[PDB]
Amino acid sequence: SGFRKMAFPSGKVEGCMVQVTCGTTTLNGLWLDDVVYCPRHVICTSEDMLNPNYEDLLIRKSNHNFLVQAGNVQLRVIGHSMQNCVLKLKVDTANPKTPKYKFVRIQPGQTFSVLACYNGSPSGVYQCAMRPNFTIKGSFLNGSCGSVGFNIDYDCVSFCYMHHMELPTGVHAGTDLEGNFYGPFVDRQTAQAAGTDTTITVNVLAWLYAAVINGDRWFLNRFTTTLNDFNLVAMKYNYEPLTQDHVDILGPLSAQTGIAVLDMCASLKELLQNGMNGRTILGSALLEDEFTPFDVVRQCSGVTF
Amino acid sequence: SGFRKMAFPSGKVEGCMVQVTCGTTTLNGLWLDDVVYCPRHVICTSEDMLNPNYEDLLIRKSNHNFLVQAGNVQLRVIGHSMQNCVLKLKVDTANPKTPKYKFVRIQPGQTFSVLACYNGSPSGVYQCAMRPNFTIKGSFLNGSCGSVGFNIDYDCVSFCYMHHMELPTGVHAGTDLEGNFYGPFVDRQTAQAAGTDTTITVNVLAWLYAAVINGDRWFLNRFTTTLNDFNLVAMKYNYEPLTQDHVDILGPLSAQTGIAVLDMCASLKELLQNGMNGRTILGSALLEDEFTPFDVVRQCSGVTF
Numbered sequence: 116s117g118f119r120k121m122a123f124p125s126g127k128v129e130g131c132m133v134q135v136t137c138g139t140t141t142l143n144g145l146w147l148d149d150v151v152y153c154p155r156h157v158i159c160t161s162e163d164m165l166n167p168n169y170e171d172l173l174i175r176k177s178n179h180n181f182l183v184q185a186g187n188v189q190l191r192v193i194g195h196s197m198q199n200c201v202l203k204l205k206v207d208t209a210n211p212k213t214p215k216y217k218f219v220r221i222q223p224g225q226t227f228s229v230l231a232c233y234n235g236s237p238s239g240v241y242q243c244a245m246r247p248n249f250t251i252k253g254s255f256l257n258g259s260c261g262s263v264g265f266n267i268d269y270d271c272v273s274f275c276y277m278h279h280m281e282l283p284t285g286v287h288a289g290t291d292l293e294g295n296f297y298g299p300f301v302d303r304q305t306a307q308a309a310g311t312d313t314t315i316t317v318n319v320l321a322w323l324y325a326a327v328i329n330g331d332r333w334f335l336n337r338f339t340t341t342l343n344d345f346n347l348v349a350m351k352y353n354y355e356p357l358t359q360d361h362v363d364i365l366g367p368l369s370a371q372t373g374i375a376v377l378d379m380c381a382s383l384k385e386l387l388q389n390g391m392n393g394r395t396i397l398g399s400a401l402l403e404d405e406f407t408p409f410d411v412v413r414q415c416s417g418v419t420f
Numbered sequence: 421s422g423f424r425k426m427a428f429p430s431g432k433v434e435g436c437m438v439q440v441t442c443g444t445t446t447l448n449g450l451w452l453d454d455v456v457y458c459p460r461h462v463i464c465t466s467e468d469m470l471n472p473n474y475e476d477l478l479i480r481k482s483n484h485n486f487l488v489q490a491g492n493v494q495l496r497v498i499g500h501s502m503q504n505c506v507l508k509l510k511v512d513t514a515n516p517k518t519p520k521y522k523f524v525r526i527q528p529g530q531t532f533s534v535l536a537c538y539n540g541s542p543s544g545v546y547q548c549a550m551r552p553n554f555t556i557k558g559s560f561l562n563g564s565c566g567s568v569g570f571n572i573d574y575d576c577v578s579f580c581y582m583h584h585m586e587l588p589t590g591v592h593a594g595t596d597l598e599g600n601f602y603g604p605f606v607d608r609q610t611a612q613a614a615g616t617d618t619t620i621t622v623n624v625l626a627w628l629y630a631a632v633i634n635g636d637r638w639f640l641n642r643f644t645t646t647l648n649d650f651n652l653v654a655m656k657y658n659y660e661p662l663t664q665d666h667v668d669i670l671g672p673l674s675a676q677t678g679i680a681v682l683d684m685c686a687s688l689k690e691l692l693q694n695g696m697n698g699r700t701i702l703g704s705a706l707l708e709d710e711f712t713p714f715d716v717v718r719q720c721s722g723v724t725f
């Protein structure tokens with residue numbers, strides 16, 4: 116029993132964190148095999164940030180202009196290249212702590228663990244989700260650039276996010292490990308704003324199933340709904356549309372609890388209308404959307420209470 | 421910006437997790453130097469658990485009855501002894517991954533990171549607090565016994581909790597690393613209940629300071645109060661008493677935000693008597709009490725390990 120916002124154990128990722136310095140700028144890098152990956156804005160001065168010409172700035176750099184530090188050991192840079200918004204520094208030593216890994220680009224609604232780092236040193240681990248507006252609600256300060264997001268399903272680490280910037284609303288933007296930004300963002304200090312955010316409906320449904328598995332049913336009702344009537348209602352509460360894909364994905368949780376997806380959809384509709392009336396669901400007074408169907412299956416028991 | 425329930429990086433602890441098997445029972449162990457620490461109930465069958473005489477059960481065991489597995493390597497048990505509710509298995513190999521460590525007994529209200537393990541393999545990391553009723557609200561399934569709680573102080577891991585059991589309410593009970601239970605619990609299959617819980621007042625105040633640092637000030641008011649007046653209010657809402665020690669500990673957060681601790685108490689008093697009125701604080705509709713004053717400072721300043 117219990118249901119917590121659970122992050123993956125960070126040890127496999129901690130062994131890859133390094134500190135990258137280019138002139139006056141210092142940030143974090145990810146050292147896998149003989150390559151160190153970091154945000155390309157490490158080559159920028161504060162006077163460059165508005166409209167940087169990265170190719171022009173990079174062509175003026177040599178290998179020895181990049182200082183890479185792993186613990187208290189200096190790594191020797193023997194090559195450098197740019198792939199989209201990520202800089203790849205070839206080093207003379209393969210990381211002995213390199214775990215089995217993959218680079219994956221995730222979709223909105225997907226969750227991951229973030230290992231927040233400063234000066235190549237991990238300071239904390241937390242779980243978060245890729246918001247529908249392609250931002251993440253992280254906890255990041257100046258110097259956290261280069262911190263990564265990952266999932267560790269089985270023994271392989273799937274890297275899905277590298278931190279690049281904070282937007283004026285306090286939310287964060289970054290790229291996949293191939294340097295492609297999530298969302299309509301750019302690595303420039305120009306005016307950029309996150310689009311209107313929405314609640315991840317399939318994730319709220321998954322979390323309602325997690326509550327049934329753990330013994331709670333106060334929110335269920337005798338009603339059902341069509342998929343379209345649910346979306347007509349939920350979108351009036353800024354909820355993302357629920358697709359047939361989402362309904363199919365919730366199939367196993369539906370079979371485990373005995374509650375059809377569209378019946379859980381009717382329960383959600385009622386919750387949005389009534390609020391909780393002083394009650395909580397899994398220790399929360401809000402509807403939680405940062406647990407996917409896959410997270411619920413991984414954390415909860417296979418036997419309903 | 422941002423504020424997350426953040427756990428310490430788990431890597432130093434992951435390198436210590438092993439699987440302990442005694443007959444039919446399998447659980448987790450903590451391997452530090454040449455000793456493996458695990459719950460002493462590993463020697464119990466389902467019949468023994470009803471009324472166990474642990475010394476009598478232990479005297480029957482030999483070193484070879486205990487199977488200890490570190491990754492895919494079998495460790496050789498060369499001795500065994502009991503300290504309170506923890507079993508100590510002496511092994512022929514010192515753990516090469518043993519970090520700098522201490523065993524500390526924490527007090528209610530203090531927080532720690534939990535590395536949830538199954539079969540000696542870490543599956544997740546989450547942050548939680550020692551509740552005033554000495555239980556923890558964890559996320560644990562069968563096989564999680566032996567999972568540990570810890571904090572990191574500079575480069576030293578302070579082990580403070582080892583998981584033993586789940587109570588009927590779904591909350592958890594365990595011991596320090598010297599086998600002393602937190603709370604009025606015993607290690608046996610018998611009816612036990614968590615006492616009435618209370619809210620950790622100094623922690624709610626710390627979290628209100630965190631919200632102010634993050635630009636959430638709607639709950640601030642022009643009022644102040646006294647320790648006597650506020651403690652009457654706290655007693656009424658099942659809040660733990662606030663002492664002069666708590667006020668002193670909140671001193672730095674008070675100086676950083678410009679809000680005197682009893683100024684923040686008058687905000688908390690108004691929140692208790694009147695609610696949030698449809699508003700949230702740091703994305704929560706409840707008053708959060710699982711962040712200590714030190715956690716707020718550490719996360720708002722980026723301390724690394």
Ligand SMILES: COC1(CS(=O)(=O)N2C[C@@H](C(=O)Nc3cncc4ccccc34)c3cc(Cl)ccc3C2=O)CC1
Nearest residue numbers: 156255256257259260279280281282283302303304421
């Ligand atoms: C909105 O103003 C901020 C960010 S900034 O310092 O002005 N800044 C510097 C930098 C940036 O965001 N860095 C940071 C990353 N993560 C969390 C940060 C929390 C505080 C300070 C900086 C942080 C950046 C990088 C790129 Cl690729 C593009 C733009 C910027 C940029 O705008 C103060 C929040």
Ligand SMILES: COC1(CS(=O)(=O)N2C[C@@H](C(=O)Nc3cncc4ccccc34)c3cc(Cl)ccc3C2=O)CC1
Nearest residue numbers: 116461560561562564565584585586587588607608609
């Ligand atoms: C309250 O009923 C439960 C627990 S139990 O299975 O009946 N049980 C087994 C065991 C125990 O708690 N184990 C578990 C620990 N953590 C999470 C667990 C989730 C499910 C099952 C077991 C879990 C235990 C150990 C000690 Cl030292 C003393 C007593 C017990 C005990 O009572 C069904 C939840």
Ligand SMILES: [Cl-]
Nearest residue numbers: 220221222225
């Ligand atoms: Cl995805």
